[PDB]
Amino acid sequence: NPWWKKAVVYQIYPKSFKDTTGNGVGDIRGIIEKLDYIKELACDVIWLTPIYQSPQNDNGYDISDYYSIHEEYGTMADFEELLEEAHKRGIKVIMDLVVNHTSTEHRWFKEAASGKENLYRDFYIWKDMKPNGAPPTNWESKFGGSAWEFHAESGQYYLHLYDVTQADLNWENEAVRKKVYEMMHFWFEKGIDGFQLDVINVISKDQRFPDDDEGDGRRFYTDGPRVHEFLNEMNREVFSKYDSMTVGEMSSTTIADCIRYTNPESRELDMVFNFHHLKADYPNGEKWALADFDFLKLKKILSEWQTEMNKGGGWNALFWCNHDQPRIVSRYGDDGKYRKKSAKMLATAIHMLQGTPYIYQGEELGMTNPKFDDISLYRDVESLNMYRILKEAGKPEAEIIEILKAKSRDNSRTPVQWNGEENAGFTAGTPWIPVPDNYKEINAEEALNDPDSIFYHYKKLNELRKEFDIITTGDYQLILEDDQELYAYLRNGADEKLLVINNFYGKETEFQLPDDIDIEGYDAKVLISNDTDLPESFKRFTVKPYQSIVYHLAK
Ligand SMILES: O=[N+]([O-])c1ccc(O[C@H]2O[C@H](CO)[C@@H](O)[C@H](O)[C@H]2O)cc1
Ligand SMILES: [Mg+2]
């Protein structure tokens, strides 16, 4: 019974969490000051997105030194004090591990690029131009364009699956794996409690490097032939030595692989995120296109991941939000009239699944997309570039702004709204990204003083996971699969059940318990609800707009 199984993790994006220095950028001291808040929310893990030394060409995911902290966030002494104060409050700390690639400003790369005969050359993935002048493969970077960048001085291309200054490490090379493990030991011995492993499932490449005539080439590196071998080796060398938690962030992976990644017998990872439920509103897999989410598909994806991982002995990391996705109230809830109720409903819908839940900073306040209506308010380079291109293509300003409001990666990066003071109390200076005007109504101080707040609903869900074992051990059973508005399911235990009923829309609808649900001899009590208007009988009743109810059934 490992500590991570009943944990709730709070995801912090430090640059937007809390500025204590006045430069408008969040810092580690700001995190320390907020530990009591995190503890009050009843999270027992904190996860920091990358804070390592980095040129910042790619939001910190381009690391030039894994052993030091980007100066703006604070000092190593600050970090060590964060670990000490977190641990004092019973809070564990996990870091972001980004080892598929490094910055091309990393010393290994600078050495490696300098000549084909340099000691570090094989730390990266180098290939010759094809005789026909083509790049070594037709693979595409996830940033667009070719995944190979030519280096004139040495006469070869290096592989970058991501941005140009993010060079893929050569995991075929034992020296590299060894270096990475040494670095992980450094952080564990400092006392951190685990890692999120960034796109870890793309580290094994097909060493034949064939062309892809059926896609962009991801089938030659996604969940590749040695990934499970590398993860298990990583587990033997590192993770097995500490009381650790590891969560792998898998890029377009499959359920069968994730079962293998997370089954305790594999000795690979503890849990994984997948992103399938967060592609439910992409029409034709077009990531920037507007569309309504496909509810039935959403329910099918969630259910499949619950039942198959449960069956296979895998473990899911449960989440709606991160620094790259729209805030969920705005995306799948109603950030208008039903902001509070729909935010509570969304939290319940996911937290009553089997898995380890993750809360993204500000999600517990029901923070919304900021709805910035002028390009001068945006920051992310992909947003600025998309605006520039759509403008040149003649799209009216208002239509471009509507796209950015739905899709900009800036949207979940606005500063956490602490209070009703200037810039919501995030900073005394000028924030690196603006705070939208809702902050006067949406902020921690307000939520903390409202017993009916989204915050306290999350706190209660968090404590429930510690109080009721069935949340962890019960199976999952989808019901009302084809219902156009309700997401309802059971968690089945030993003479004990949870019945979870969520209205995903703002209309009234009928719930009726299916005949094949056997609850003879079971007594019902409300475990948690977002509405005091409770049905006389849960077996058939009219569900209110965005109503969410969980019943504890015991025999
Ligand atoms: O510049 N960036 O910060 C950046 C870099 C890459 C990126 O795409 C992808 O690869 C990342 C690995 O780095 C993962 O973190 C992320 O989950 C995934 O979507 C998104 C943003
Ligand atoms: Mg600061």
Side-chain angles (χ1 to χ4, degrees):
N1 298 340
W3 62 263
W4 46 260
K5 233 186 183 57
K6 300 184 175 179
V8 177
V9 183
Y10 192 73
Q11 183 186 346
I12 289 174
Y13 178 60
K15 85 172 68 173
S16 288
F17 183 75
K18 175 64 171 135
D19 175 16
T20 59
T21 64
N23 64 344
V25 172
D27 47 69
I28 293 165
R29 175 62 46 188
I31 300 175
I32 297 173
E33 289 183 6
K34 291 306 184 178
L35 290 172
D36 285 345
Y37 169 83
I38 301 175
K39 185 59 171 185
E40 180 179 1
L41 178 57
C43 294
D44 46 16
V45 188
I46 283 171
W47 158 30
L48 300 204
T49 61
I51 63 177
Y52 315 87
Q53 189 173 313
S54 159
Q56 308 280 344
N57 295 323
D58 293 287
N59 302 118
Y61 293 80
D62 54 321
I63 295 162
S64 52
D65 192 316
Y66 293 94
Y67 287 86
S68 73
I69 290 162
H70 179 60
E71 244 178 83
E72 222 187 8
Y73 295 131
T75 59
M76 182 62 71
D78 285 345
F79 183 79
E80 289 166 17
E81 188 186 333
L82 167 61
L83 286 181
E84 184 170 25
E85 293 306 303
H87 289 166
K88 193 167 305 182
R89 291 161 174 81
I91 297 169
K92 296 198 169 52
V93 177
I94 64 169
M95 293 279 284
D96 221 285
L97 177 82
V98 184
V99 293
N100 175 69
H101 50 260
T102 75
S103 177
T104 47
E105 294 306 316
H106 197 285
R107 69 191 142 76
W108 298 337
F109 183 89
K110 296 170 74 101
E111 291 250 30
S114 72
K116 296 172 82 285
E117 262 74 44
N118 178 272
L119 170 69
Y120 290 95
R121 182 70 175 191
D122 293 348
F123 271 51
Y124 299 88
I125 303 175
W126 299 97
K127 293 268 163 307
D128 296 333
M129 171 180 285
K130 278 183 179 167
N132 69 347
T137 81
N138 71 342
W139 297 0
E140 191 141 28
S141 161
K142 285 134 190 323
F143 272 57
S146 181
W148 302 92
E149 173 80 359
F150 190 71
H151 189 255
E153 314 81 312
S154 66
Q156 290 192 296
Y157 295 77
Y158 65 90
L159 175 76
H160 61 99
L161 293 187
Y162 296 94
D163 211 346
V164 181
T165 69
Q166 290 173 298
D168 281 53
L169 285 166
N170 182 14
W171 277 76
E172 296 306 297
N173 182 346
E174 268 204 316
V176 166
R177 299 194 232 119
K178 256 72 156 68
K179 291 279 187 183
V180 165
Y181 304 153
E182 288 173 356
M183 174 275 293
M184 298 171 63
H185 277 290
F186 168 80
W187 288 105
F188 274 113
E189 285 155 5
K190 197 175 290 286
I192 75 165
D193 302 285
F195 278 116
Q196 105 109 13
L197 295 73
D198 183 70
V199 297
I200 194 67
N201 73 324
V202 302
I203 61 175
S204 167
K205 273 76 172 177
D206 188 313
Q207 294 303 293
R208 289 346 293 258
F209 297 93
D211 280 338
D212 193 351
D213 65 356
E214 221 71 39
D216 60 11
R218 72 184 61 181
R219 69 168 153 184
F220 302 106
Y221 61 71
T222 307
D223 300 307
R226 300 185 71 188
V227 186
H228 302 280
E229 174 195 352
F230 292 150
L231 292 173
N232 170 262
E233 184 191 81
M234 183 178 287
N235 184 297
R236 282 164 27 219
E237 288 294 311
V238 183
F239 298 142
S240 72
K241 310 283 177 59
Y242 307 95
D243 193 7
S244 53
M245 176 187 115
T246 59
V247 52
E249 168 189 62
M250 306 322 202
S251 165
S252 66
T253 186
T254 70
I255 290 181
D257 276 290
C258 286
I259 295 174
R260 286 222 279 160
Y261 288 138
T262 62
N263 186 302
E265 219 59 40
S266 295
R267 292 176 197 284
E268 293 179 33
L269 304 179
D270 297 309
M271 62 189 84
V272 289
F273 305 115
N274 67 292
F275 286 82
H276 295 96
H277 61 306
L278 302 188
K279 292 179 207 304
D281 62 14
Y282 292 10
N284 305 313
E286 293 146 7
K287 67 154 58 176
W288 279 87
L290 309 183
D292 302 332
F293 67 97
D294 188 334
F295 185 50
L296 302 192
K297 173 188 288 191
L298 178 59
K299 294 193 286 190
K300 185 179 174 174
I301 290 168
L302 296 175
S303 302
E304 197 180 11
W305 280 85
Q306 286 284 296
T307 63
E308 299 307 285
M309 291 284 267
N310 173 268
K311 220 255 237 70
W315 196 257
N316 285 302
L318 304 172
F319 79 114
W320 277 131
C321 279
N322 75 4
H323 55 295
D324 287 331
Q325 300 285 335
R327 292 195 169 272
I328 27 65
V329 223
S330 299
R331 187 192 198 165
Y332 291 169
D334 166 25
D335 65 17
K337 168 175 158 57
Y338 294 109
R339 194 190 59 93
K340 286 190 211 299
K341 265 177 193 177
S342 70
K344 290 178 195 172
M345 175 278 293
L346 289 163
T348 293
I350 198 181
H351 279 241
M352 292 294 126
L353 298 177
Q354 181 177 58
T356 301
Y358 287 64
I359 297 169
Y360 179 76
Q361 60 187 38
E363 172 188 338
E364 76 286 6
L365 309 175
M367 285 181 53
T368 66
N369 287 346
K371 300 166 176 189
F372 288 152
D373 82 328
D374 196 278
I375 192 56
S376 77
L377 295 170
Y378 290 85
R379 295 292 183 268
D380 181 70
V381 299
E382 189 185 21
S383 284
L384 269 35
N385 197 43
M386 176 75 65
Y387 179 95
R388 189 183 59 82
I389 297 305
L390 296 172
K391 200 92 204 299
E392 297 182 339
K395 214 167 195 83
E397 162 98 12
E399 297 182 3
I400 302 175
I401 288 306
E402 282 309 295
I403 295 174
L404 288 183
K405 286 178 177 176
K407 293 301 192 161
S408 175
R409 297 205 297 249
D410 282 330
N411 287 344
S412 68
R413 299 181 183 168
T414 71
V416 179
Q417 288 157 201
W418 296 110
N419 64 28
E421 307 285 297
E422 309 260 22
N423 294 294
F426 159 73
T427 184
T430 301
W432 77 272
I433 190 174
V435 183
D437 287 329
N438 68 45
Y439 76 91
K440 288 188 289 172
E441 301 83 59
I442 306 175
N443 62 78
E445 190 173 86
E446 190 281 337
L448 283 185
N449 195 245
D450 173 10
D452 191 44
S453 63
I454 299 157
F455 180 95
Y456 289 121
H457 184 89
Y458 269 92
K459 176 185 200 334
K460 182 169 189 197
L461 285 173
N462 295 348
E463 296 186 335
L464 282 175
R465 184 168 277 281
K466 297 302 198 301
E467 293 161 351
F468 289 80
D469 187 62
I470 190 175
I471 296 171
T472 304
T473 55
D475 70 7
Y476 170 92
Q477 185 185 8
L478 172 67
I479 55 175
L480 308 195
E481 166 173 50
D482 295 327
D483 196 289
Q484 294 284 331
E485 298 164 89
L486 300 179
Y487 178 32
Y489 56 91
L490 286 111
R491 303 285 310 279
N492 300 285
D495 288 345
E496 182 186 27
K497 294 184 198 309
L498 303 176
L499 169 64
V500 179
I501 306 173
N502 304 289
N503 192 348
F504 255 69
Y505 296 90
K507 291 172 191 165
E508 290 191 339
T509 355
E510 301 298 308
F511 177 80
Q512 178 176 303
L513 189 69
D515 292 346
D516 65 337
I517 303 308
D518 179 2
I519 49 161
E520 210 62 63
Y522 285 77
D523 296 330
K525 285 180 178 203
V526 181
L527 192 66
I528 188 178
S529 183
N530 66 352
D531 187 344
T532 57
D533 189 355
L534 296 178
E536 188 235 19
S537 171
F538 67 89
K539 293 179 51 137
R540 186 203 140 225
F541 69 99
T542 293
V543 190
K544 274 46 244 289
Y546 293 102
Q547 185 161 33
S548 177
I549 310 174
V550 185
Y551 285 102
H552 187 240
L553 310 179
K555 192 188 206 170

